[PDB]
Design an enzyme around this catalytic site. Structure first.
Site, PDB file in Angstrom:
ATOM      1  N   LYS A  63       0.465  -8.055   8.333  1.00 16.03           N
ATOM      2  CA  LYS A  63      -0.464  -8.313   7.194  1.00 16.03           C
ATOM      3  C   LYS A  63       0.055  -9.497   6.425  1.00 16.03           C
ATOM      4  O   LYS A  63       1.044  -9.399   5.707  1.00 16.03           O
ATOM      5  CB  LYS A  63      -0.514  -7.006   6.329  1.00 16.03           C
ATOM      6  CG  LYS A  63      -1.498  -7.097   5.161  1.00 16.03           C
ATOM      7  CD  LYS A  63      -1.411  -5.750   4.306  1.00 16.03           C
ATOM      8  CE  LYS A  63      -2.425  -5.973   3.157  1.00 16.03           C
ATOM      9  NZ  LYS A  63      -2.378  -4.576   2.458  1.00 16.03           N
ATOM     10  N   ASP A 151      -8.142   3.684  -3.346  1.00 17.01           N
ATOM     11  CA  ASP A 151      -9.141   2.940  -2.531  1.00 17.01           C
ATOM     12  C   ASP A 151      -9.457   3.679  -1.209  1.00 17.01           C
ATOM     13  O   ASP A 151      -9.467   3.082  -0.104  1.00 17.01           O
ATOM     14  CB  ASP A 151      -8.631   1.472  -2.320  1.00 17.01           C
ATOM     15  CG  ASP A 151      -9.719   0.532  -1.823  1.00 17.01           C
ATOM     16  OD1 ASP A 151     -10.911   0.798  -2.086  1.00 17.01           O
ATOM     17  OD2 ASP A 151      -9.286  -0.484  -1.153  1.00 17.01           O
TER      18      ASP A 151
HETATM   19  O1  LIG Z   1      -2.539  -2.870   4.601  1.00 10.75           O
HETATM   20  C1  LIG Z   1      -3.419  -3.186   5.449  1.00 10.75           C
HETATM   21  N1  LIG Z   1      -4.562  -3.837   5.083  1.00 10.75           N
HETATM   22  C2  LIG Z   1      -5.504  -4.116   6.021  1.00 10.75           C
HETATM   23  C3  LIG Z   1      -6.636  -4.896   5.583  1.00 10.75           C
HETATM   24  N2  LIG Z   1      -7.547  -4.175   4.624  1.00 10.75           N
HETATM   25  C4  LIG Z   1      -8.546  -4.943   3.943  1.00 10.75           C
HETATM   26  C5  LIG Z   1      -9.699  -4.492   4.891  1.00 10.75           C
HETATM   27  C6  LIG Z   1      -9.516  -2.976   4.971  1.00 10.75           C
HETATM   28  O2  LIG Z   1      -9.907  -2.434   3.637  1.00 10.75           O
HETATM   29  C7  LIG Z   1      -8.028  -2.871   5.111  1.00 10.75           C
HETATM   30  N3  LIG Z   1      -5.402  -3.674   7.286  1.00 10.75           N
HETATM   31  C8  LIG Z   1      -4.295  -3.021   7.693  1.00 10.75           C
HETATM   32  C9  LIG Z   1      -3.291  -2.758   6.772  1.00 10.75           C
HETATM   33  O3  LIG Z   1      -2.352  -2.103   7.386  1.00 10.75           O
HETATM   34  C10 LIG Z   1      -2.704  -1.879   8.709  1.00 10.75           C
HETATM   35  C11 LIG Z   1      -2.011  -1.219   9.655  1.00 10.75           C
HETATM   36  C12 LIG Z   1      -2.552  -1.071  10.950  1.00 10.75           C
HETATM   37  C13 LIG Z   1      -3.779  -1.601  11.094  1.00 10.75           C
HETATM   38 BR1  LIG Z   1      -4.564  -1.360  12.888  1.00 10.75          BR
HETATM   39  C14 LIG Z   1      -4.524  -2.354  10.180  1.00 10.75           C
HETATM   40  C15 LIG Z   1      -3.928  -2.480   8.906  1.00 10.75           C
END
Ligand SMILES: O=c1[nH]c(CN2CC[C@H](O)C2)nc2c1oc1ccc(Br)cc12
EC number: 2.7.11.1
Length: 328
Positions: A63, A151
């Site tokens: 991220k 959220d």
């Molecule tokens: O901490 C994150 N954030 C987001 C992005 N956000 C904004 C869009 C959605 O609300 C989520 N994805 C991930 C986050 O941690 C993850 C771990 C594994 C995976 Br597969 C995807 C993610």
């Protein structure tokens, strides 16, 4: 003023170090150890990529944060570190940054997620019981550790459906719960905002995540997503009031001594409560049991103090087969 009915003293009893996130000194890892393979996500505050850890050739998620204030990022980091290892909480594996720009990346465990718009139509009645139970494990855990996620919504629930594995992600909006503290109401995402956010009641608690979960759960059982489809924050309260009715909203506002903005009051109007069974129809009929509707009813209450806690929710008879299965 209002206080959580459970876990209210968790941060009072723990050392100051646990919750005083601005005191964290981040121990930065090696940016070079994680290589981006392809993009998998994005939001207002990050771009998210599937990666490889070049040491052990294991998948991970990277991220990459958009420019962010130190206070804000230490909050997400400390909350992730505190919850790492708990049931169904995404694991933060490392924290790294680009030397030139100082752009920070959080590195997570990988999940093979299928976006909800494509996954949720394929879920059977029992699958919805199972995945909501797994999400509840995560929420009781974070609340028990003195944290509100703030959220909850399908976009923050990663599910690898082949492995039946769920992780709650994106702790960017999460905070520590301290009794009587007045929090910012500009949290959650609109369709999942509790009435307390929509009427400016700032002394809210873990129960906010239970409203959001109820919104998600009503979308799944009724196949009507989002279930409360408001355009702006005022319209979001109107969409709620048209379902739960304004009588209960008035009881709530009077209990907490809240007055609605005159503009908002006029938009909300007066409405009768619409029984949950009126949402039933042929696309959803296979999902709408009396146990589902009872459980939903006990989450979607105006008064945050009346909602089920996550621990109570887990024991509702709606999940009794999931519990039986999980005893082994
Ligand atoms: O901490 C994150 N954030 C987001 C992005 N956000 C904004 C869009 C959605 O609300 C989520 N994805 C991930 C986050 O941690 C993850 C771990 C594994 C995976 Br597969 C995807 C993610």
């Amino acid at each position: 003023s209002s206080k959580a009915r459970v876990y209210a003293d968790v941060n009072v009893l723990r050392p100051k170090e646990y919750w005083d996130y601005e005191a964290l000194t981040v121990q930065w890892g090696e940016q070079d150890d994680y290589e981006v393979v392809r993009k998998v996500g994005r939001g207002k505050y990050s771009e998210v990529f599937e990666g490889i850890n070049v040491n052990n050739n294991e998948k991970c998620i990277i991220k990459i944060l958009k420019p962010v204030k130190k206070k804000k990022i230490k909050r997400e980091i400390k909350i992730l570190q505190n919850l790492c290892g708990g049931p169904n909480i995404v694991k933060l594996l490392d924290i790294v940054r680009d030397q030139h720009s100082k752009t920070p990346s959080l590195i997570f465990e990988y999940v093979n997620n299928t976006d909800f718009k494509v996954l949720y139509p394929t879920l059977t009645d029992y699958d919805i019981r199972y995945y909501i139970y797994e999400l509840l494990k995560a929420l009781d855990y974070c609340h028990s550790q003195g944290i509100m996620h703030r959220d909850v919504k399908p976009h923050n629930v990663m599910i690898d459906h082949e492995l039946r594995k769920l992780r709650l992600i994106d702790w960017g909006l999460a905070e520590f719960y301290h009794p009587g503290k007045e929090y910012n109401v500009r949290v959650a995402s609109r369709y999942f905002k509790g009435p307390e956010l929509l009427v400016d009641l700032q002394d809210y608690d873990y129960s906010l995540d239970m409203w959001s979960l109820g919104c998600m759960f009503a979308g799944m059982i009724f196949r009507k997503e989002p279930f409360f489809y408001g355009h702006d924050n005022h319209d979001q309260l109107v969409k709620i009031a048209k379902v739960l009715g304004t009588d209960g909203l008035n009881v709530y506002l009077n209990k907490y001594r809240i007055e609605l903005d005159p503009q908002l009051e006029a938009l909300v109007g007066r409405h009768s409560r619409k029984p949950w069974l009126k949402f039933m129809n042929a696309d959803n009929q296979h999902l709408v049991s009396p146990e589902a509707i009872d459980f939903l009813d006990k989450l979607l209450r105006y008064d945050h103090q009346e909602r089920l806690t996550a621990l109570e929710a887990m024991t509702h008879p709606y999940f009794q087969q999931v519990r039986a299965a999980e005893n082994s």
